[PDB]
Curated annotation (Swiss-Prot), chain B:
Subcellular location: Cell membrane; Cytoplasm; Melanosome
Keywords of this entry: ANK repeat, Calcium, Calcium channel, Calcium transport, Cell membrane, Cytoplasm, Glycoprotein, Ion channel, Ion transport, Membrane, Phosphoprotein, Repeat, Transmembrane, Transmembrane helix, Transport
GO molecular function: calcium channel activity; identical protein binding; monoatomic cation channel activity
GO CC list: axon; axonal growth cone; cell body; cell surface; endomembrane system; growth cone membrane; lamellipodium; melanosome
Protein name per its UniProtKB record: Transient receptor potential cation channel subfamily V member 2
Cytoplasmic side: 41-61
Residue stretches spanning the membrane: 20-40, 62-82, 121-141
Tissues of expression: Ubiquitously expressed. Expressed in dorsal root ganglia, trigeminal ganglia, spinal cord (Lissauer's tract, dorsal horn and dorsal columns) (at protein level).
GO annotation, biological process: calcium ion import across plasma membrane; negative regulation of cell population proliferation; positive regulation of axon extension; positive regulation of calcium ion import; positive regulation of cold-induced thermogenesis; response to temperature stimulus
Quaternary structure annotation from Swiss-Prot or TrEMBL: Homotetramer. Interacts with a cAMP-dependent protein kinase type II regulatory subunit (PRKAR2A or PRKAR2B) and ACBD3. Interacts with SLC50A1; the interaction probably occurs intracellularly and depends on TRPV2 N-glycosylation.
Full-length numbering of the shown residues: 477 to 666 of 761
Domain of life where this protein originates: Eukaryota
Extracellular membrane side: 6-19
Its biological purpose: Calcium-permeable, non-selective cation channel with an outward rectification. Seems to be regulated, at least in part, by growth factors, like IGF1, PDGF and morphogenetic neuropeptide/head activator. May transduce physical stimuli in mast cells. Activated by temperatures higher than 52 degrees Celsius; is not activated by vanilloids and acidic pH.
Length: 488, 165, 95
């Protein structure tokens, strides 16, 4: 029976999702003596194969009850391993972890999608011996002193297959811990192996964007008033073709990532900025063929945006890459909020200075007074007892009040940023850069919009036991003296 | 070594009577005054302070400089290109120095009436200022997160190593 | 015998440097009952003087396995002092 009403569904309101069936309830509550009874009784046995209204099995439901606290993780992990061991005795022909829910997710793919890093790490690195050895995903190959060599099962992990764990962590997951998942074994060494065979293509793509932006800059600097004329024409059609090529490549990115589009740019706004640069480039060439003066502002905005776009390729090196992540500290989250308060002070004092400066005994417009008031924030603000005005003393007191209020606001804003950002939390910038490398690679593995390249499998097809049990397995060598010496 | 090389080269260029001896003599003079800061290690009070003043390595400022020079030169080529039309950003050096002046509290903002596209020139300047202040604020906060972590002050030991060398 | 192939050398890759000889292995793994057997047996005694392909003795190899954590330090220090005490009984003429 499926308890399927709105109280039993997963949502932000008042609910208890456990799957929908007794067995999934008994597992999610940790009643291991009810689980074995429901499975092993003669009257009506539960099946580990049974699914709820989302297509979730009890193993999917266990991934759904996981938080990343150590007690909840230990309890989900014990129940999950127990139910696999039970399946190995009660339905030995059935691969319970190959069952997909209605979203097309296995329990490992669901753990990756929902950001359940503790049960995700557990499933991905799982090992057993004797009767349960075929339930492993990790197999020790040899161990000698501080060195362990292991084979890891890549079956639903490698990006050669559609909708893999790597594609899910990069593009379908929206959890803040995505960067912690890509640095686990075997994903860490697997993504490094993919990076090391694609790094030459990354810097070829950078060199092509440098050559495009060099030509863009040389052409924008040599615009005429509204042999060298033929080279300037060649430069405009190279900018048009590079703009069309980048536009097609970016429209193709957002088409491939359409099902998850609102997250496809969330840590990857350079896909918006490369699309916008290509649009403004093509529009500037259309306006240039129409001979309208407004082509030059669009060409110049495309030029600035194209130099800012070269900062994308800083992720190709560890030294600049990780720094590009450290420099994200102060999000627009606080500066867009401070900007609301600051623009109310700016425009409130600007309308006041313009109104009061009308009388002589120069703040001539709202733009004039806003720019004079903004100059105080950049160290350039003029204070004078401005003798030609009537109410000059009140104009000076308005300026002194604006300065003191703005310095109170800026000092409050800076101190509030320090209280939020300087809290001695561990520097996760290396992991967030490994996630930027993962996203870049998983894109480069598809090739170009016009070239659509064929992929290759990673690891090797190897026998690991009986269930012969042959799998695509990836060899990882761990050296760990600190973990080894504690065993002696 | 560099001060001694530039000193000997300045005297060789002076014997050749070329004007470029004076830039080398003056660069050797500046570098020679900066070299007197070596001897601050002779006293505990200045020595240890010379070690405390190493906090902000070129490690982060050379990385910030890459981002900053892309903003600087990207907006400099744009301002020069757009200021060609009247209705002054005359060269890349001129526009780079005007854009750099915002970082030292000296940057001119004006609705620059003699230009065509003056409003777009002002919006480019306002965008450069806001981006540069976001970058500088991010750089300063990222330095605080790396450097202000309550680790023990090892500057006495690093000065004892300078004395040892 | 000197286990001297690229897995047994010290480098940034996948390796286990312990010196290259049984006695240096037995010391680097903390097998003090294997160390005294290899040193004191009648069939073929190990020498504390024996060196690997870098010229390292077991005392150099112990310095090479040291990290600055307190447990690894206590274990390297106990093994290092034990081997000097053993040398004072098995090769007393040798520094
Ligand atoms: C119709 C088939 C044409 C084949 C052209 C082959 C070009 C190969 C170079 C290439 O694709 O470089 C990628 C680069 C942008 O970098 P990115 O893909 O990582 O993207 C950034 C992702 N964040 O791209 C650029 O910088 C543009 C290069 C200039 C245009 C080339 C000629 C076009 C003719 C139509
Ligand atoms: C390919 C190298 C294998 N060797 C280790 C070299 C240092 S080995 O000595 O043959 C060995 C050791 C231990 C185990 C085990 O515990 O499974 C298996 C094989």
């Amino acid at each position: 029976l499926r308890a399927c009403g709105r109280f039993f569904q997963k949502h932000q309101g008042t609910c208890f999702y456990f799957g929908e069936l007794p067995l999934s309830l008994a597992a999610c509550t940790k009643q291991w003596d009810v689980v074995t009874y429901l499975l092993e009784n003669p009257h009506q046995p539960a099946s580990l194969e049974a699914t709820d209204s989302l297509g979730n099995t009890v193993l999917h439901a266990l991934v759904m009850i996981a938080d990343n606290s150590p007690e909840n993780s230990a309890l989900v992990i014990h129940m999950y391993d127990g139910l696999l061991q039970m399946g190995a005795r009660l339905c030995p022909t059935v691969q319970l972890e190959e069952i997909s829910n209605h979203q097309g997710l296995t329990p490992l793919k669901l753990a990756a999608k929902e950001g359940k890093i503790e049960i995700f790490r557990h499933i991905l690195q799982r090992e057993f011996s004797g009767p349960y050895q075929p339930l492993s995903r990790k197999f020790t190959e040899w161990c000698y002193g501080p060195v362990r060599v292991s084979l890891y099962d890549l079956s639903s992990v490698d990006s050669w297959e559609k909708n893999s764990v790597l594609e899910i962590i990069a593009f379908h997951c929206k959890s803040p811990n995505r960067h912690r998942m890509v640095v686990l074994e075997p994903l860490n060494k697997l993504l490094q192996e993919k990076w090391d065979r694609l790094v030459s293509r990354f810097f070829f793509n950078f060199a092509c964007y440098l050559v495009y932006m060099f030509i863009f800059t040389v052409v924008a600097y040599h615009q005429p008033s509204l042999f060298g004329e033929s080279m300037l024409l060649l430069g405009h059609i190279l900018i048009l073709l590079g703009g069309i090529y980048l536009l097609l490549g970016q429209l193709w990115y957002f088409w491939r990532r359409r099902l998850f589009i609102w997250i496809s740019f969330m840590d990857s706004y350079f896909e918006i900025l490369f699309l916008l640069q290509a649009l403004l480039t093509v529009l500037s060439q259309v306006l240039r063929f129409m001979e309208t003066e407004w082509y030059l502002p669009l060409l110049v905005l495309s030029l600035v945006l194209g130099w800012l776009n070269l900062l994308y390729y800083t992720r190709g090196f560890q030294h600049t890459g990780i720094y590009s992540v450290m420099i994200q500290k102060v999000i627009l989250r606080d500066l867009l909020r401070f900007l609301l308060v600051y623009l109310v002070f700016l425009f409130g004092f600007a309308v006041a200075l313009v109104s009061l400066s009308r009388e002589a005994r120069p703040y001539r417009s709202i733009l004039d007074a806003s720019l004079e008031l903004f100059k105080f924030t950049i160290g350039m603000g003029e204070l004078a007892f401005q003798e030609q005005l009537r109410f000059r003393g009140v104009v000076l007191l308005l300026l002194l009040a604006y300065v003191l209020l703005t310095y109170v606001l800026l000092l409050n804003m800076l101190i509030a940023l320090m209280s939020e950002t300087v809290n001695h939390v561990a520097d996760n910038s290396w992991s967030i850069w490994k996630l930027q490398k993962a996203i870049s690679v998983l894109e480069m593995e598809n090739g170009y919009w016009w070239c659509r390249r064929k992929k290759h499998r990673e690891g090797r097809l190897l026998k690991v036991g009986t269930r012969p049990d042959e799998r695509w397995c990836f060899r990882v060598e761990e050296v760990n003296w600190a973990a080894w010496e504690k065993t002696l």
